[PDB]
Each structure stands twice: as structure tokens, then as C-alpha cells.
């Protein structure tokens, strides 16, 4: 009814420990969600065009041309790690657990409140807010996944990460098909590169509406909505990283001479000439057996063209890579391709008291060593006459195409049947948790944006809207915009995310890396004197595991 | 007890024929294993560094820098074909069988003998050997695979291939994490290329010890150890090779004119103009239908950058390839990338009476025709105007990067969704049998070092050690090395490897290739007048099978 609550606030994470080292981690997340009535009650097909920016030669990477259907609905998205765990919970998970499973998801809307705003004609602004007890909130659960999948974490538009801070839903929109051509150029190109937007292909048109595709529930102040429990079928997520490169696979060479005194200058020596050694190599025309030429079971990681942009029907897009750059751990400035960069606002980890539109940014460096150091790569002749001469070796400094800033590694691909790689680690708090699998016939082996992928399906998107609150002067025949009473809603969203995790075991004599609070990061986890909070990112795959 | 044997010597291979053309091949292998007490009773973290060798410009491929934990334990490894089969058994297998399955593995240690050495003070050396009836041999079976996987076949350090020749175990060591950077150079580079060893990443440290990870059994002269039967879950291994290239897939063109007289100069002719023919091609802008342009179901084999070295956290390593070079069968000198080269000593096939540290070497040429002949490759313009002109074709002789010894094929990768390839053939006697699968999330489609791969796990590594035999003057507080009575052990190792194989069938009118003894190789299988034995390599995939 009007004066009866329809739900309870719960934001507790429970760790129920099972037998055999397994734990059920049920994270509860409760938020107060504020929603305004849509700017327009219609669906719009809006073409965003920034040909001015890309008309500058060399700016083709800044292309934003696209077409989107803007809908009157808003999306309630909780597909981010920060929506579910605080730094203490994440510390417990990443320190005491070795693998993580995604078990189930539930969400519900309760304690719906709808208020109308009456603004007076007095010259200084003044307004009052009245409860509209008969107003309704339109809630649609796309449990069949009919609507396009538009996760908000990629735009930093999920629910807020603070239980005590009210959050908002994101206005929903989806991509409409378009055709676009953009010939790349550079500073110094003469003429106007081909840069046109060709329109839309009629055979690819797909105009979706929530009304025609999903059942819609009208919730009054005394109503509540529950989606029901959804159960995932994803793969386990490892909370351990691998450190072994191809150089550290298998049996090391026997050292016939060992150091007689400790110290950094004292080295063990194999004691056998490199061309007189025993072993197996894939180089059938050389007698040298070294750490770089000896046979290994397979290849850890792969090389791909980095900062390569491929053009397709809808324009250019960067070629993704599964693994981050090698050497970003020895030198943090080397983080670039494959090291995801997260930019977020005050709702999602940035200092809440900051002013301005500049977001808080961080580049994530994974502990796994599956990356590549292209500056140390090279190609050489099949003859393999050592030491190699100039014409028989292609080095990373050799120009490709006549460009001194482009080398073969930029266009180099080593993906093959022997490539072995890991899934992307969870990124806390701004990383996505689960992502829908592509509906293609042949599917990618992994996604670079979420550690869990939906093989069959994952829970339907939740859409909310303020039902039209018409005045007495509504005329559907009029071409002017619908006249509505200014209405807004505040409702409580509660979600339950259930994981299954395995407790880690100590395999080595030495201790391992753990996340800990210290003097440097001590104040990143507590509020300031005025209430300013923040959530800094945390690494997940802290403990190491042996690859081979 | 002291005077009671605890096992029997068995080195027989049994072929028990089943119904429906299947045979159980149980190979028994018995060896006398001699073990010396470890040089040191401690674990050492030894850094092998050869910066002197790689400081020579162009010698970066000879990098041996690495770090290893040297343990006081020795590894008993029987993961090689020669440990289980003699040339007659291998001939029977490769001639009468079409596929091979790895069923089970057992090993055991018995008839343990421990002897102490007493050396006299007399000026001419003289010594006696006494049985230490109360001395113990420490045996650890890592059935849980907690320790790093270090197969010895890659170093030619498995058990000997001769039943009547006593063998030794290999001292065990494993790779410790390290960071290394090496900028490639060539003869003619000016300056000192960046060449440093950066140390160890604390987050990747993994110090393993047998004592803290595996149960240890103390075997006295009257004790024996049995691991128990382990059962594999690997894929079948084909003993047949494929000969069909993309040029030999599907229906050949109809010959409207056939030769009227036999002879090498008389050819059949299609009789239709290449641009007037019927068929399907993937080239949508050409009317030519030829043997090189006609559509095929998929691609057999693939091209990859050969003799490409990729650098990662721990230095440079050669990029592996699944298939060997094409044309190595028409010209044995073309064997290079992908054709494994085996180097071994007198225990593993080399003439036992040879003197010197030079190993016996051979490059393996597989009968399967999945390789590539890069000298016959080329790229040309999408326009496809024939005959192609200079600027519209990139040939294998065209310099890439300005280097006349490097062409596009050196950096060329054609692996894709249409690539079809075979697993590596068994290499007798020096090839590995089974290999552990990588613990990565995404796993390689095959391993280039063993025909069988351990999906879940494969039998734990066996470690042996001589238990410390202290003197009366032991003082654990002393910083000097432990003083031990010089002790060594001789024990009998018996293993049983069970395979399941299918008998081959005659599918064609003509006979097929079989391994046979002849005048040229007659004396490669019998001892010399002084007992000198050898085991030359044998090819496995002799018979052909149709790919399509």
C-alpha cells in the first residue's frame, strides 16, 4: 500500500565456507536510484557526426561517426565489480582465494516513490514536491535478451559503488546500422582524404522498442518488482597469474660448474659448448642448443599488430589484443596496447569532492607475463649463420614501408596453433563481471572486457521509465511535444550476486604477494574530514601459479 | 630383508591381439640405475649468465641467461621412445599399425643396494666398497604434480635405451623467475646494445622443495617402491601421414584430351580455356579457373614467420612452428624450421664406443606434406591482371625493410580459421612420448615435442636421493658444508608402458612404404666386434592416408 514498505535494504557480503576448501560468496548490493522522466517520450534515430575532427589529417583515430537509437528508457546496470564488493571484501577474495566462479544473479525494485514538481510563478525560483500516489513506474525485464546488449561498464555508467550514496540509471540507447568510409592520412598528406557517411543499409535495419518486445510492469508506490534468480554457466576465473615465459618451460640445462661464493657477480656455467650440447630444437640446420633456440612444448602468449586500425562497413576500429605489453612491470611507462585504461567519474571511484569534467584514469598492469617485448624481437635468415650480418636480420629498428616510426613488429602476427594464453583478469572496481557471447557461428576464445562470458545467455537487461503523467491539455493530433506533469521517481534497487570460490593453498617455501594496507595507501580506503570517498583500483591475480 | 630380492627384471614387449583389429602393446623396461650422493645437500638459486657471448653483435640467438633452482634430488625419467622399444618392436609398430593410444604407465624401484666407499691413505690410490645395510634411499613420487614439470627428453637425459647397459638419473633442477632484456643487433651495429639482467620479480617467486611438497619413502636394502598404475586420457596418435596439399583436394578437372602413347612427354590436356572453364573460386574479379585459383574446402598447413625470435619478460625465444619445411623431402638440405633436430650422447643412440663430447645429431623429416615452400610463395594485387607486372607482385626475392636477406615470407603468417594440420609424429628413439598440458586458460592445439598431451594430468615425476650418511663430527651450527660418508646406490627400476593400437588395412592396389633392414642399414641394429651399439632414428608415419 501507500504506507507499507515492500523490501529491505541489504548490502552485506557473506562468505559461507563449504567443505573441501570451497566458499559461497553472496554479495548483496542496495542502492537508492533516482530517475527523471525522459526528455522525450519518443524513439529518435540520431546520427552523431564529427567529420570536422577527422578532416584534420592524421586524426582518423578520433572518428566518432555513428548512428544510435535514443530511447525514452533508462538502463539499470550492476555489471561492475565495485557495485558488489568494497576494498575489504576484494582484499579477502584476492588474498585467500585461487579461483572464482559466477553462480547466480538476482535483482529487484522496491519502495517506489513518485513525486511531481510544482514550480511557482514567483520571480525568485521556488518549488514544491508532492507525492503522486497514483503515478506509475514502467519496469521491463528483457529476460529473453531480445534487445541489444549494451553493458554500461564500458562507458562507466553502472550503478554507484557506494551503498550510502544514491545513484542513477543511465539513459538507454543502442547502435543503428550505418555505412562509413574514412581513408587514413597523416600530417603532411596533400588533398582531402575520402571521408563520407553513406547512410544506412536497408537490409541491416533493426529498430527495437521496449514496448513491442518486452512485458512492462506498472509499479505504483505500493508495488515491487523481482526478476528472479538467474544461474550462470560460465567458466572458472583464475585469481592466480602465470609468470613462465617460453624461456622458463621444461628442464633447465645442467650446470657443470656452480658458483663457489655467493654474490651477484658469481654465475653458474653450463660448461658445454653451445654447439656440442644435447637436446632438441626445431632448427634443423643448426647445432647450437641455447636457451633461445631449444625446443619448448608450445608458445606462451602471441604477438599481434599493435595500434593497428581495421576498417569495415562502419569505419575504423582498433584491433584488440588479449595480453598486455611485456615490460610494463619493469617499466610502468611501457603500458600501452593490451593494458586496459579505465576512465571514470565520481560515482565509480573518483574522489567525490573533485570539481570539473576531467575523469579519474588508471592503466591496469596485469601480473601475468604473457605479454611481448617487441623491442627485443627480431627475424633472421633461415641459414642462421652467427653472428648475423646486416642483410640477414630484420630488427625492430628497421623501417617498414619507408617509415622510420614503423617496424615489422607493428605488423607482426605470431598467433598460431601453438599459442597458449590466459583470460583477462578481473579489474576492480571498474571492471565488468560478465559479458554476452557473440551470436556468430565461430566465437572468440575470450573477451577482453570481462572475465566471464555468457555461453547461452545471461540475465536480461533491466529498463526503467517514468510513465507519462499527462496534463489536462493533451492532444495526440498535435505535432508539438507531449505536455507532461514534471514527475520523477526514487526507488530502492537490491541485487544479489552469488559466486563460488576456492581457497588458495601454499605450494612453495616462500610467501606470495598479498594486497595490504600501508602508509602510502592508508587514506585511499577511508573518508576525508568532509566525507570525500574514493575507490582506487586493486589487482586480482596476485598469487603465482606454475604454467608447466 | 638383506638377502631377499624385492623384484624381477622384465624388459619384454608383449603384443596381445584383440578382436576387431586392436592390439594391447605392453612394453616392459628394466634398468640398473646408479646414483651418487648429491654434491650438495642444499637447494641453490644459481644464475647462469653468458653476457660475454651475446655481447658480440649478432649473437643474441645464443642467449643462455637464466636462473635455476638446483636441488639435491635426481630425476628418474622414462619419457622417451627408446626406453621402451627396440628397433624390431618399433618396426612392427610402424609397419603393422595405423594409430597408437597411450593407455597406462607404471614404475617401481627394487633391489636397492647402498655402498660406502673407504679410500686409503696409501700414496697410490686404492679403495674398498662396503655394503651399508642400514643406509636409506629417499624416493619421492610427485603424484599430485606439485613440482615443476621438467621432462628430460628435451635435454637427452632420460634413462638409457639399452636393457643390458646400466643407466643413471639426471640431477633435478627447475627454472626460477628472472627478468632479462636483450636488444638484437647484427655484425655492423655501432655501440653496445642494451643487454641487462634485471633480477627477479617478487610476485613470481616460487621456491619448491621435495621435502615440503611430496611424501618421502626411505628404502633400505630390503625395501621396494611402486608408484601404482596411472591411466592416460590423451588423444589417439596417427601412424599414417597425409600427402594431399591444397592442390590435390577435391575433384580434378576433366581432361578432354588424353595421351595416346605412354611416356613422360605425353600429357593429358584439360581442353578448355582457363577463362572459359566452369567451377568455383574465391577470386570474384577473375574468370580464370586453374589448379592454383580454384576453390578448396580449407587450407592444409599454414605459413608462419620462420626463425623469428620473440622477446618476453625473460628474454628472447624462437617462435615454434607445428609443421616442418616443404621440400625437405625433395631436398634433404632444405630441412630447417619445424624439422626437429635431436642431439644425444652414448646412452641414447650414439655409438657407445665413440670418444669426445661431440653428440650424435639428426634432423627429423616427417613424411606428412603439411609444410610450406616459401620460395614458391608470392603476393599480388587484388586486380589480378595477368601476366603480373613488377609493382603488382611481391616475390620472395623482394627485400623487406631494406634487407636483401629478409623477405615477406620471413614475417608472413597465414594461420586462420581454415587452417588444418596434423599432430607431430613420434620420433624414435629420442622423441618424447607424453607431455603435460599448459595450465593456461586458453591452451595450444598441440605440442611440438610429444605426440601425446596430458589434458588433466600425467604420472608424477619420480625423484631419488641418497639419504645423508653423516660422520661422527656433524655440527649443524657450523657454516661449513655437511660432512658425509661417501655413499652411493644401485637400484633396479622397472616400468610398464601400455599402449592400445589399431592394425592397419590395405586400402589401395599398390603397396605402401615399410621400414626394412637392408645392406646399407644392416649393421645399425647389431653390436660390433667389441660390443659397440647404437640406435639410429626411425620414421613412424610411413603409410599414407587420404586427407579428403
Amino acid at each position, epitope marked *: 500500500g501507500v504506507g507499507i514498505s515492500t523490501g529491505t535494504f541489504n548490502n552485506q557480503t557473506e562468505f559461507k565456507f563449504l567443505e573441501n576448501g570451497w566458499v559461497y560468496i553472496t554479495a548483496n548490493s542496495s542502492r537508492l536510484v533516482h530517475l527523471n522522466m525522459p526528455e522525450s517520450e519518443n524513439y529518435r534515430r540520431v546520427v552523431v557526426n564529427n567529420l570536422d575532427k577527422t578532416a584534420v589529417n592524421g586524426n582518423m583515430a578520433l572518428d566518432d561517426t555513428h548512428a544510435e537509437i535514443v530511447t525514452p528508457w533508462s538502463l539499470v546496470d550492476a555489471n561492475a565489480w565495485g557495485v558488489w564488493f568494497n576494498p575489504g571484501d576484494w582484499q579477502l577474495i584476492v588474498n585467500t582465494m585461487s579461483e572464482l566462479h559466477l553462480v547466480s544473479f538476482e535483482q529487484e525494485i522496491f519502495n517506489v516513490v513518485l513525486k511531481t514538481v510544482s514550480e511557482s510563478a514567483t520571480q525568485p525560483p521556488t518549488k514544491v514536491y508532492n507525492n503522486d500516489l497514483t503515478a506509475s513506474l514502467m519496469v521491463a525485464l528483457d529476460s529473453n535478451n531480445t534487445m541489444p546488449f549494451t553493458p554500461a561498464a564500458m562507458r562507466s555508467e553502472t550503478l554507484g559503488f557506494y551503498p550510502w550514496k544514491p545513484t542513477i540509471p543511465t539513459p538507454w540507447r543502442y547502435y543503428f546500422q550505418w555505412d562509413r568510409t574514412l581513408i587514413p592520412s597523416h600530417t603532411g598528406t596533400s588533398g582531402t582524404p575520402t571521408n563520407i557517411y553513406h547512410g544506412t543499409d536497408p537490409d541491416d535495419v533493426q529498430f527495437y522498442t521496449i514496448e513491442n518486445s518486452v512485458p512492462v510492469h506498472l509499479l505504483r508506490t505500493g508495488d515491487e518488482f523481482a526478476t528472479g534468480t538467474f544461474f550462470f554457466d560460465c567458466k572458472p576465473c583464475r585469481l592466480t597469474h602465470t609468470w613462465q615465459t617460453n624461456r622458463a618451460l621444461g628442464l633447465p640445462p645442467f650446470l657443470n660448474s656452480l658458483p663457489q661464493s655467493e654474490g651477484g657477480t658469481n654465475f653458474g656455467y653450463i660448461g658445454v659448448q653451445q654447439d656440442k650440447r644435447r637436446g632438441v630444437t626445431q632448427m634443423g640446420n643448426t647445432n647450437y642448443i641455447t636457451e633461445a633456440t631449444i625446443m619448448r612444448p608450445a608458445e606462451v602468449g602471441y604477438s599481434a599488430p599493435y595500434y593497428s586500425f581495421e576498417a569495415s562497413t562502419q569505419g575504423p576500429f582498433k584491433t584488440p589484443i588479449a595480453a598486455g605489453r611485456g615490460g610494463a612491470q619493469t*617499466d610502468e*611507462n611501457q*603500458a600501452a596496447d593490451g593494458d586496459p585504461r579505465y576512465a571514470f567519474g565520481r560515482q565509480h571511484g573518483q574522489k567525490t569532492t573533485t570539481t570539473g569534467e576531467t575523469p579519474e584514469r588508471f592503466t591496469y598492469i596485469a601480473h601475468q607475463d604473457t605479454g611481448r617485448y617487441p623491442e627485443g624481437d627480431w627475424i633472421q635468415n633461415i641459414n642462421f649463420n652467427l653472428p648475423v650480418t646486416d642483410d640477414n636480420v630484420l630488427l625492430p*629498428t628497421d623501417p617498414i614501408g619507408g617509415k*622510420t*616510426g614503423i617496424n615489422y613488429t607493428n605488423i607482426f602476427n605470431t598467433y598460431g596453433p601453438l599459442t597458449a594464453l590466459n583470460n583477462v583478469p578481473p579489474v576492480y572496481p571498474n571492471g565488468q563481471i560478465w559479458d554476452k557471447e557473440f551470436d556468430t557461428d565461430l566465437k572468440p576464445r575470450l573477451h577482453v572486457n570481462a572475465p566471464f562470458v555468457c555461453q547461452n545467455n545471461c540475465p536480461g537487461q533491466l529498463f526503467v521509465k517514468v510513465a507519462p503523467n499527462l496534463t489536462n491539455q493533451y492532444d495526440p493530433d498535435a505535432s508539438a511535444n507531449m505536455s507532461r506533469i514534471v514527475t520523477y521517481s526514487d526507488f530502492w534497487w537490491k541485487g544479489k550476486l552469488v559466486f563460488k570460490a576456492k581457497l588458495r593453498a601454499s605450494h612453495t617455501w616462500n610467501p606470495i604477494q598479498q594486497m595490504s594496507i600501508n602508509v602510502d595507501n592508508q587514506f585511499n580506503y577511508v573518508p576525508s574530514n568532509i566525507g570525500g570517498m574514493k575507490i582506487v583500483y586493486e589487482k586480482s591475480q596476485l598469487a603465482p601459479r606454475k604454467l608447466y | 630383508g638383506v638377502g631377499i630380492s624385492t623384484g624381477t627384471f622384465n624388459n619384454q614387449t608383449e603384443f596381445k591381439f584383440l578382436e576387431n583389429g586392436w592390439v594391447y602393446i605392453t612394453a616392459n623396461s628394466s634398468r640398473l640405475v646408479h646414483l651418487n650422493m648429491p654434491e650438495s645437500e642444499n637447494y641453490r638459486r644459481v644464475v647462469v649468465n653468458n653476457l660475454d657471448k651475446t655481447a658480440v653483435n649478432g649473437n643474441m640467438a645464443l642467449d643462455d641467461t637464466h636462473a635455476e633452482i638446483v636441488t639435491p634430488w635426481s630425476l628418474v625419467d622414462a619419457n622417451a621412445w627408446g626406453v621402451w622399444f627396440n628397433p624390431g618392436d618399433w618396426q612392427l609398430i610402424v609397419n603393422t599399425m595405423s594409430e597408437l593410444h597411450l593407455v597406462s604407465f607404471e614404475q617401481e624401484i627394487f633391489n636397492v643396494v647402498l655402498k660406502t666407499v673407504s679410500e686409503s691413505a696409501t700414496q697410490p690410490p686404492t679403495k674398498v666398497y662396503n655394503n651399508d645395510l642400514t643406509a636409506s634411499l629417499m624416493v619421492a613420487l610427485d603424484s599430485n604434480n606439485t613440482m615443476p614439470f621438467t621432462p628430460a627428453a628435451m635435454r637427452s637425459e632420460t634413462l638409457g635405451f639399452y636393457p643390458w647397459k646400466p643407466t643413471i638419473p639426471t640431477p633435478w633442477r627447475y627454472y626460477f623467475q628472472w627478468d632479462r632484456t636483450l636488444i638484437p643487433s647484427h655484425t*655492423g*651495429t655501432s*655501440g653496445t646494445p642494451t643487454n641487462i639482467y634485471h633480477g627477479t620479480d617478487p610476485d613470481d617467486v616460487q621456491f619448491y622443495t621435495i621435502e615440503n611438497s611430496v611424501p618421502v619413502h626411505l628404502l633400505r636394502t630390503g625395501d621396494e617402491f611402486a608408484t601404482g598404475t596411472f591411466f592416460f586420457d590423451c588423444k589417439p596418435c596417427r601412424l599414417t601421414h597425409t600427402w594431399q596439399t591444397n592442390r590435390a583436394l577435391g575433384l580434378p578437372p576433366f581432361l578432354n584430351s588424353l595421351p595416346q602413347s605412354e611416356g613422360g612427354t605425353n600429357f593429358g590436356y584439360i581442353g578448355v580455356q582457363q577463362d572459359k572453364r566452369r567451377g568455383v573460386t574465391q577470386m570474384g574479379n577473375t574468370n580464370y579457373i586453374t589448379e592454383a585459383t580454384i576453390m578448396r574446402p580449407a587450407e592444409v598447413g599454414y605459413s608462419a614467420p620462420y626463425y623469428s625470435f620473440e622477446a618476453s619478460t625473460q628474454g628472447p625465444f624462437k617462435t615454434p612452428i607445428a609443421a616442418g619445411r616443404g621440400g625437405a623431402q625433395t631436398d634433404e638440405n632444405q630441412a630447417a624450421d619445424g624439422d626437429p633436430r635431436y642431439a644425444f650422447g652414448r646412452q641414447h643412440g650414439q655409438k657407445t664406443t665413440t670418444t669426445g663430447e661431440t653428440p650424435e645429431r639428426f634432423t627429423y623429416i616427417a613424411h606428412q606434406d603439411t609444410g610450406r615452400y616459401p620460395e614458391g610463395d608470392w603476393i599480388q594485387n587484388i586486380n589480378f591482371n595477368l601476366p603480373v607486372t613488377d609493382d603488382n607482385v611481391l616475390l620472395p626475392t623482394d627485400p623487406i625493410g631494406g634487407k636483401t636477406g629478409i623477405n615477406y615470407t620471413n614475417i608472413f603468417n597465414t594461420y586462420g580459421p581454415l587452417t588444418a594440420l596434423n599432430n607431430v609424429p613420434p620420433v624414435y628413439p629420442n622423441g618424447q612420448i607424453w607431455d603435460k598440458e599448459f595450465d593456461t586458460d586458453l591452451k595450444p592445439r598441440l605440442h611440438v615435442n610429444a605426440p601425446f598431451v596430458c589434458q588433466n594430468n600425467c604420472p608424477g615425476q619420480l625423484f631419488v636421493k641418497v639419504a645423508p650418511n653423516l660422520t661422527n663430527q656433524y655440527d649443524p651450527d657450523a657454516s661449513a658444508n655437511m660432512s658425509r660418508i661417501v655413499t652411493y646406490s644401485d637400484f633396479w627400476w622397472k616400468g610398464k608402458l601400455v599402449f592400445k593400437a589399431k592394425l592397419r588395412a590395405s586400402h589401395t592396389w599398390n603397396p605402401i612404404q615399410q621400414m626394412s633392414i637392408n645392406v646399407d642399414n644392416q649393421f645399425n641394429y647389431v653390436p660390433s666386434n667389441i660390443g659397440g651399439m647404437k640406435i639410429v632414428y626411425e620414421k613412424s608415419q610411413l603409410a599414407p592416408r587420404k586427407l579428403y
Partner: antibody, heavy 122, light 110 residues
Framework: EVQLVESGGDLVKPGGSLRLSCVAS????????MGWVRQAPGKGLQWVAW????????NYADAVKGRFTISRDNAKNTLYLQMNSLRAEDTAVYYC???????????????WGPGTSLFVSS | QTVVTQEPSLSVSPGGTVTLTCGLS?????????PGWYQQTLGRAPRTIIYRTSSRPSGVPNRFSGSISGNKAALTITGAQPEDEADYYC??????????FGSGTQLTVL
């Protein structure tokens, strides 16, 4: 945009010490390898010191090894060159140098400061 | 010790083409040396003309071109203007993290 300003150059007697300070603006200071070059009065440019990497690894020319120390403070966006046991041969104009390649270094001085003169005389 | 040799002095008429060369007494200059060219006027700090043997910083006129000729680095000024008269210094990356500088070439526009 990218600006480098050097200061601390002053007359100093032989055998003394002096710290040159280089203030950088218009760019992320910690993301670029920095260095100190020097030009003697009437002579050509000579590389003095280089600081590179997130670990602040340092390399020095043979003429200043053991005597010069190159450091950086990214909080202050400052580069410090501390010279000890100064000689008459160290008298010169010292230029701040910034490499423009953060993830792929140009291995060359992308930006230069106005320079600070140091005179060593008894 | 590494020594970089370049022409002590060079001359060019207005609107002409001149080439300044930078070599090594022992060895050859390649793209692995990342040759850099810097321009210095009297009483002013050096200005970067070329980096990575071909790249001129934004604002550098196109008349300056960097290349590798023979076993040396080459800086070519085409249509040389009066303001191009200055001391041009060549920097070679000598591996590891060591840099070397040439003696310098005094280019005067007639």
C-alpha cells in the same frame, strides 16, 4: 606547451658541488626519459647524464661517472643534477633534455631548456 | 671511445640544397642509432630538427629532411633560407642508454 627551465647555475670553485634543478611543464613528467647535456664555452654539445624508466635508472658519461648524480622528483616535476668534485673542465652551459617517446623512446633530445651556465674557476 | 665526425663548416647559397653528414670513426650509422639533428643559433639553446633519423618535430619546416646515407646520417636542407644559418649538431644513440654528440657543423647561408 612543453617547457623546461633550468636553474642553479653559478660560479663555483674547483672541487665544489652544485645542484642544477630543471622544472618541466606542459607534459606528464614521470612518463618521459630526461637527461642533462652540456656545451663548453665555444665547444659542441656533450651528453652528460640520462634518467629513464619508471624505476629511474640512471646512466652517465665517462667524463662525469662517480662525480655526477642524476635524479628526478615526479611530484615536483623536477630533474636534479648534483655535481661533486667539480673541475675546470665542467664549466659550461647545461641543457635539460626531454625525450618525446614515452612508450617508444625517440632516443634523442625532443625538447631542450634554455640552459644554465656553470663556471668553475679558482 | 665513440667519436662522431661531421663537417666542421659548410656553406649553401639561398634557395640551394645542402647536406650535412654525421659518421662514426669506427663503425657505421644505422636507424638503430636513432640519429638526431639539432639546430643552435648564436646565444640560444639547441632546437630539435630531426629525431629517429626521419621525424621532424611539429613546426620544423619541410625543407629539413633526415635520412641514412651510406654508413652515416644525413640532414638535407633544400631551399635553404637565411634563418637556417646555425650550428647543426648530430646525436647518435650508442646502445644501452648512452648518447654521443658530433663535433657540429657551422652552416652559413651566403
Amino acid at each position: 606547451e612543453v617547457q623546461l627551465v633550468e636553474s642553479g647555475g653559478d660560479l663555483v670553485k674547483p672541487g665544489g658541488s652544485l645542484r642544477l634543478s630543471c622544472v618541466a611543464s606542459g607534459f606528464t613528467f614521470s612518463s618521459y626519459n630526461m637527461g642533462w647535456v652540456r656545451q663548453a664555452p665555444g665547444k659542441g654539445l656533450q651528453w652528460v647524464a640520462w634518467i629513464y624508466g619508471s624505476r629511474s635508472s640512471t646512466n652517465y658519461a665517462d667524463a662525469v661517472k662517480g662525480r655526477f648524480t642524476i635524479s628526478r622528483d615526479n611530484a615536483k616535476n623536477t630533474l636534479y643534477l648534483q655535481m661533486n668534485s667539480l673541475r675546470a673542465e665542467d664549466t659550461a652551459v647545461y641543457y635539460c633534455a626531454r625525450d618525446g617517446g614515452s612508450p617508444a623512446a625517440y632516443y634523442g633530445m625532443d625538447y631542450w631548456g634554455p640552459g644554465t651556465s656553470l663556471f668553475v674557476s679558482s | 671511445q665513440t667519436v662522431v665526425t661531421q663537417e666542421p663548416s659548410l656553406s649553401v647559397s639561398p634557395g640551394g640544397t645542402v647536406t650535412l653528414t654525421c659518421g662514426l670513426s669506427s663503425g657505421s650509422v644505422s636507424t638503430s642509432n636513432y640519429p638526431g639533428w639539432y639546430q643552435q643559433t648564436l646565444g640560444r639553446a639547441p632546437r630539435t630538427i630531426i629525431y629517429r633519423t626521419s621525424s621532424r618535430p611539429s613546426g620544423v619546416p619541410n625543407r629539413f629532411s633526415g635520412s641514412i646515407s651510406g654508413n652515416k646520417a644525413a640532414l638535407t636542407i633544400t631551399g635553404a633560407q637565411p634563418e637556417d644559418e646555425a650550428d647543426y649538431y648530430c646525436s647518435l644513440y650508442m646502445g644501452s642508454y648512452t648518447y654521443v654528440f658530433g663535433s657540429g657543423t657551422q652552416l652559413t647561408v651566403l
